[PDB]
Amino acid sequence: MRTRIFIGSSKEGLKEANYVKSRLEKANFEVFIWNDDIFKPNKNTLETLLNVASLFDFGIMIATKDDFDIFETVRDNVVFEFGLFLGRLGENRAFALQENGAKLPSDLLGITIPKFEKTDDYFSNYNLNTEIDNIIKIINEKISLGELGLLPSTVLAIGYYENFVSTVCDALHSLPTIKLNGIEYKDFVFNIIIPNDLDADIKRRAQIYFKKMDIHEVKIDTNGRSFPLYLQIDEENSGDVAVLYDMPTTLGGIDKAIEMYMKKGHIGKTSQQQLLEERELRNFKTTLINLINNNSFTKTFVKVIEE
Amino acid sequence: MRTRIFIGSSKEGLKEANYVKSRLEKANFEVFIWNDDIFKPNKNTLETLLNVASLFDFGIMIATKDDFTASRDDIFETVRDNVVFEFGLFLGRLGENRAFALQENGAKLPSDLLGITIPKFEKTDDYFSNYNLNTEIDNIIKIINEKISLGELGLLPSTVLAIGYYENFVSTVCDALHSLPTIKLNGIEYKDFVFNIIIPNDLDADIKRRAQIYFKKMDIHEVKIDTNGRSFPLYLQIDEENSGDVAVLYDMPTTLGGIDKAIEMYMKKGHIGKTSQQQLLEERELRNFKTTLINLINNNSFTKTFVKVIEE
Amino acid sequence: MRTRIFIGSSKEGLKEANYVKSRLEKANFEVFIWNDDIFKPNKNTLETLLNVASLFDFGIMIATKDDFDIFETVRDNVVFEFGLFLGRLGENRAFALQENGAKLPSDLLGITIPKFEKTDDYFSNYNLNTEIDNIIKIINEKISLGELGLLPSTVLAIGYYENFVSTVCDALHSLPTIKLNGIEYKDFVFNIIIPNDLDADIKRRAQIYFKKMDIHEVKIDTNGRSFPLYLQIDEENSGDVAVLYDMPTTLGGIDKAIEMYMKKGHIGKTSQQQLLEERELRNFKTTLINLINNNSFTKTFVKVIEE
Amino acid sequence: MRTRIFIGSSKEGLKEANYVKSRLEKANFEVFIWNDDIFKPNKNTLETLLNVASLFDFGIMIATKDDFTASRDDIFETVRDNVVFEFGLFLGRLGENRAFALQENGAKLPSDLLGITIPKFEKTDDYFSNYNLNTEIDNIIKIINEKISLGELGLLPSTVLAIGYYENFVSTVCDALHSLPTIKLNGIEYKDFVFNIIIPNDLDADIKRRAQIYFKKMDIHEVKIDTNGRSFPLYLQIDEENSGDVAVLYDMPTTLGGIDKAIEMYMKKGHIGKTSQQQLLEERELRNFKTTLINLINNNSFTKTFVKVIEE
Amino acid sequence: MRTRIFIGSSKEGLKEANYVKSRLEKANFEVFIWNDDIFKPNKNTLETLLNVASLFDFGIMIATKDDFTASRDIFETVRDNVVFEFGLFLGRLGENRAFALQENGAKLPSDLLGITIPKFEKTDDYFSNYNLNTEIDNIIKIINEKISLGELGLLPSTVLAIGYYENFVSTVCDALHSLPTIKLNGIEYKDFVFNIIIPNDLDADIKRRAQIYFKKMDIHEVKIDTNGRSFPLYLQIDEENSGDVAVLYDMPTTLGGIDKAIEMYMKKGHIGKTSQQQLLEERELRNFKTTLINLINNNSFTKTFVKVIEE
Ligand SMILES: Nc1nc2c(ncn2[C@@H]2O[C@@H]3COP(=O)(O)O[C@H]4[C@@H](O)[C@H](n5cnc6c(=O)[nH]c(N)nc65)O[C@@H]4COP(=O)(O)O[C@H]3[C@H]2O)c(=O)[nH]1
Ligand SMILES: Nc1nc2c(ncn2[C@@H]2O[C@@H]3COP(=O)(O)O[C@H]4[C@@H](O)[C@H](n5cnc6c(=O)[nH]c(N)nc65)O[C@@H]4COP(=O)(O)O[C@H]3[C@H]2O)c(=O)[nH]1
Ligand SMILES: [Ca+2]
């Protein structure tokens, strides 16, 4: 799916925030402003950058000279929200764009804060346009290399990859001929089923998906592990290439953790919980795809398939 | 081990931070201050928050009425802006569940900032008689001990790894062994079982290879357990010479390999050696995994007295 | 149905109670005052605040200076009735609105009691209107999230859901083709019939409802239980989608629970027993709907239909 | 087990509360006072009522002529309104059926507060000879024992769960088996049957999974029974090994899974561990479920000597 | 040994270079200036920066406001010579091993390809300038933090050390740690130590040198079976000086490959060794030893069990 970007700004900076959102939207991006219709339960602008700021891939903060409530000074509120945004989104996923006359620094912890002139027609300013273009270019290169972070879904994907997918690929590639359930195959494909959402238990969902698709079970012996690899094979749609299937079970762990940490004494899901679940699924899928594409033995033999 | 607490302050808050650190050490804690010898690579007092402030269990912010003025700090044009930005960065790095704040009277900070109470105390030379600061530190200690005793959880990679490992392997193994009228593993009958989970000392070696050589050195033999909670049998390791009356089972978690390689991929630049931040992150991940696993084990009647977490 | 809200007040707070009731009615709420025409058998304001106050979704208390009979002091009466209110409605279903200057603590066990100026034309006080708006917003938010309590109907709904409805949906979704009684279906819908009232035995009522509507019986084999799931299918109005029916049986248990609990030395039903019956039915329906809507395998496949 | 009684009082009524508690243990009761070491998370004596006072079978208050004055309490501006509000909260948590009250001479509380008798007793240093207080405690004990002996029930979730489970499964099973001239289950003839209901010790494990592993551990075989009281046959479990002359049937109620899940969703915040209030609530739910099931079994001729409730 | 640092400057700016060399020398560093007695065969400074500049761990370049005019030696303008030697220095030493120090008024940038070029004021007594002193201190701190983490580059000795480590030393340590008891040549040991013999120089064939070292020290061969390789690990054991802790020995053979490569690259029709060849050999040996030690110290199974010992 498209990359999610959060834009934080004060009440006076909605014009700049909307212009930046539109410009990013024309660049095939998903953009949410701090007062988006998603963040209605949030009371003020401070707690939306505390609760649902890290739930986005990147973030942009806009500073306004005029903005210089909770605190006793607008300057204090601006610097506090800047610090909170930078801490929540780190130094690799955070970007800043202060207007001309704003007296914030320009090299805060490795994050540049370019200055743009305050005008009325924003389809005229070369400086603001080129700064937004630089931000877009930086975001586009990070997504293509595969910048990683200690997110739980990223670690889950890395562990799942190295301990199951690479082992399966090595075991299948180390066979002079592929003999699965007594049937010979001249090639194989490894399909990883990623659930559309974390609204159901992963184990039962995987079991019922296998039952509905009528997928049998295979056992693969590997020298890279002390116990065999257990998989699922089609046996009906697989004529010449072995069609193997698997739904990751670590997703059960992330679902249980999200349920424990989010769910208070209520049954319904808050907006923050839903955003966190979608973010975890997106990072898991993206990290798994990036890990797959960077190995010669798993590149064209493993495909990530939606449920 | 002990609970690690990070204390952030300004250049003039060293007295307050040192007193708080000493009083916390009196309460069986492991306190680190922003100016400690661990954080030497951090050039200023702001990168020590962006880097290692989130690597501690809890954090305390001390604010004094000396940085709430208009002066120069070589980073922000005003020291007040610098201290407010530092407070915001601290809160963002540690969140609303692991951040505590102490301010002296006269500071312009709020008192109900995003669910974080910031009590005021009267500054004095002798802090052993300061009732206000002493009682606020007492409340901080009480809250920290309460959140450690329940099991307050947070989406850290190690916490999620421990939860997944527990739910998918440990509970399933305990249910499989408890659903047997007699425990017959490798053709030997046992009247009881104990499931030892071996946590590595560190993450400086590959977890799979380290577990394999640990099993070889201790001479532990593999077993297979059939379960109704999974589509394929659970594979474990049994001792078979020291397990005469009670079946002794061993397992080194493999998700620790995933977290180890993730940390290697993230923190390690083009250098062989490990930075202090990487070591702190690995220690925090390992400790959090062990603590979360212990908390999950102790909150289930089927695993409370049958699974023991043992250091390598 | 509309949310039921109870207003507790003394004899001199009647104008405030009527104003709040009118505002909540304009805010799409059902409001009953302590001296409503339904609370006629109740003698004083204390026994009606003990017996039928917990039978409403939420509650509002109003304090007045003039009240500062059963006790020897009116102030003692007011604080005692406030305590009884809090004990009946807990900390999540209780709200309070004291008039200006009232000396009640403002953080009584986590419940705020805002102060409003005592005027004559109640369509003028900004403070009272914004406090009522805040109360309405809080109530509306705690209904969209599914806030849950320890009511027997809620527990019955949770158990019924997780033990029957989720199992049935998982069993039906785990089928490569839907084959019920030898008829192939391309989809299915599960209809749960909730009785209009608890004035009849649930088992016999379900049987007669089925035999009027002419619904057959089916058996479904599931891996989530030790014995097969038994349902009811239409087979006449179901052409391509399997239309299933079921009346919950625990409703009989709760029905006879109220039957034995309400000291039935007579034949007719008192007002408290009746209002409790609709409260339990409403809570059961709401909890079941919230549980259904939060599972991907039951969301669009289960429908709660009135009898 | 024993009957739990909660005693609520002020900070100066500790002597009377201790005396009454001691007499109730002399009368075979399990009494907890608001200042006990179990109610530590409750910071004051007001949160002790709103949280755990409704988790006890019965409750008793002692009121003294020390807090019916005008003083400071840091919560209410006067101690008189504080004690009256505390009385009201206690009554609201416990109602008119499970609450008892005691006042000494000089207390301004009424004596017929909504059907709750509040007798007056004389304060003295040597309380073992106070005829009024001793006879009021005796009357309270008599009333409590009368309530326990009779099937006194309230709208608790566990009580409704037990009523539904009984009247929908146990009575139907007993009627189906008693309507058979001979008991033939799985092709084996028996001259009599016994139905054992397995109540788990605690709610720390999934009830369905725990029942399944218990059945596997005891090698228990499933049976199907046809009945005219329900549209589809009843499914039960039989031993087939120890049932030589009388058929033994085992069944762990599944609605206990419902109450366990409801308690987990309600009481558990973002923490792995269990609070004291949650543990007390789970114990109370299990006790009321077992008590209601036993009372319903004993209040029917077709189930009194044929169904037995046994712990796990 | 002490870290090697090269300072390049012009003839008219040798006083700043000498002061920087002395200041680094007081900081436990080995410093050579382009006009040192080692680089006599080199004709000019340009040839020195092309041949031996990369043979040092780090490099420092000094620019002054006296060779920036439109004067007249290899190029036409002394401006061109300065910018050319700066480019050659930065290319030879890369961006992780190059440092610059221009004087006040110099025209060079301050963020040239990631290499900061601080400006200092030119005086007569350099034990007075706070700016130059703090710039040299910053350079020293950067070099110190680089040497302690283990910054690595694609040098042949670094790659040789990495391959040798991960293919022999780690495998040997895992094989020995995966033994319930250590049984080498029929003798039981309760502990082991792995000694890696690094030759003092590359002036002799590594294979024959290792063989004669083993013969002189009377070290016997052992065979170790491992699950991390398809064929066993062959080592050497003392068997006389090892009573309770087994003492194992090995001289790396990849040093033979690096010695052969250096001999093939540098010898061009003579028997004696050029100073550049000697510097390259010392650099390769030092980087091999340092990389091996760094790799050893960052593994729990090899930290206290493997020691790097001089011949
Ligand atoms: N179909 C299939 N999928 C596989 C297999 N092995 C791994 N996976 C997938 O890879 C994920 C990560 O496995 P891990 O690193 O070994 O980390 C595992 C491991 O440490 C431990 N564990 C799980 N199963 C076993 C086992 O059978 N034996 C042992 N000794 N440990 C196990 O629990 C961790 C989390 O397990 P999961 O939730 O299951 O998540 C697993 C699972 O989704 C396999 O043989 N077949
Ligand atoms: N049409 C239909 N509805 C179903 C079926 N299974 C469950 N339900 C519905 O789900 C409700 C909750 O079931 P529970 O949690 O298992 O809790 C149940 C269970 O523990 C026990 N029970 C009931 N029937 C059986 C049975 O056939 N076998 C066994 N072993 N236990 C049963 O009595 C508890 C309360 O039973 P209920 O009042 O009936 O309420 C039941 C019933 O209305 C089914 O196969 N068909
Ligand atoms: Ca979920």
Ligand SMILES: [Ca+2]
């Ligand atoms: Ca590592």
Ligand SMILES: [Ca+2]
């Ligand atoms: Ca040579």
